[PDB]
Amino acid sequence: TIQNDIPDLYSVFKDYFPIGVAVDPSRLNDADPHAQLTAKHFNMLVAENAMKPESLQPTEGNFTFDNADKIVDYAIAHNMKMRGHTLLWHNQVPDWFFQDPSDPSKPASRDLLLQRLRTHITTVLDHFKTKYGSQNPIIGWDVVNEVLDDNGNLRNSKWLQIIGPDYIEKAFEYAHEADPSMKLFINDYNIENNGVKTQAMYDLVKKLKNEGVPINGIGMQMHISINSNIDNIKASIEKLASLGVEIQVTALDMNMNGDVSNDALLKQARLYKQLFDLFKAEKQYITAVVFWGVSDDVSWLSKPNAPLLFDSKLQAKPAYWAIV
Numbered sequence: 001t002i003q004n005d006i007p008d009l010y011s012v013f014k015d016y017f018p019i020g021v022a023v024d025p026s027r028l029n030d031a032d033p034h035a036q037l038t039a040k041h042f043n044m045l046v047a048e049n050a051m052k053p054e055s056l057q058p059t060e061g062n063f064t065f066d067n068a069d070k071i072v073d074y075a076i077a078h079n080m081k082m083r084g085h086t087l088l089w090h091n092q093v094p095d096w097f098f099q100d101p102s103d104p105s106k107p108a109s110r111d112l113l114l115q116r117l118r119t120h121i122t123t124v125l126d127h128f129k130t131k132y133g134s135q136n137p138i139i140g141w142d143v144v145n146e147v148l149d150d151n152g153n154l155r156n157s158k159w160l161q162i163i164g165p166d167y168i169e170k171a172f173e174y175a176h177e178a179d180p181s182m183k184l185f186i187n188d189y190n191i192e193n194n195g196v197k198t199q200a201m202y203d204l205v206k207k208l209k210n211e212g213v214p215i216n217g218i219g220m221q222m223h224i225s226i227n228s229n230i231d232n233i234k235a236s237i238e239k240l241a242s243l244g245v246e247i248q249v250t251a252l253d254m255n256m257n258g259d260v261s262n263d264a265l266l267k268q269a270r271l272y273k274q275l276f277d278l279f280k281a282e283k284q285y286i287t288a289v290v291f292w293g294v295s296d297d298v299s300w301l302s303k304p305n306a307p308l309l310f311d312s313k314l315q316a317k318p319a320y321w322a323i324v
């Protein structure tokens, strides 16, 4: 059971930015404590998995929007905005995209893969626009996810192998053409560490924006750890923000490296407080902060862990109280 009388988390940040959360469609019923926690504390929602490519077009032409729509219906019912995650990735994407349909032992051509990407993006954005219209809660999409490798080069996924480096620009062009009302993001992890990947994200967005690619924002996943350096996060935000794009913290959680002791929870609270003070300080750039999961028991990190503000019993942790 949840604590009904403690402060609604997002309300603490109303003069700064929406606070959202990634959810599973099976945790949205009124009587479910995870759904109670979701509606109480967040004013923004993201599908943890239901809007990924395999979740929306498992086989060619066979679109499966029921789970995504269940999440959108819930967001509408609770007056929450949404982020769309994600139109292109190298995981949770079906193999059929990359196969020649007459000979599945061979790869699709550059033109066929680009056409498939255009059809997927356009169908996905047109589905939400035609079904929900002005009530569509989605304000933007992660158009491409994790396109850099950890050395800062372009990740050599099947998209890069078949099409070449301009597949990124093309995804943005297709999404902008389908729905020019959506803010378009490039999303990635490790770009908060102020290392080679941060520099590479800055370089790639600088280049694509100067070429007229309609990129509106950079999504910083923020899968940080109990040992993360706040100074590196602040320097990454400043560097990426200098491009004149919005910054959203899209998938925040904290890896405890197996240490879930009471001492570690107190260290986690001090670090989360510093992190949120930094986000507030950078409110002129940051337009959303989203946690990657509702509570520790449903976090995607392997066990043992304690990554979020609500524990495995759905209770507020020391980090919740430090932030509010």
Ligand SMILES: O[C@@H]1[C@@H](O)[C@H](O[C@@H]2CO[C@@H](O[C@@H]3CO[C@@H](O[C@@H]4CO[C@H](O)[C@H](O)[C@H]4O)[C@H](O)[C@H]3O)[C@H](O)[C@H]2O)OC[C@H]1O
Binding pocket: 048, 049, 145, 221, 251, 292, 300
């Ligand atoms: O048919 C069933 C399968 O579909 C099911 O497969 C599961 C699907 O969930 C995978 O875990 C997900 C991996 O993505 C994580 O989100 C990432 C987090 O990192 C970045 O922020 C990134 O941008 C996000 O997309 C999700 O949090 C996580 O749930 C899982 O690995 C896979 O096995 O398996 C069972 C079948 O019945």
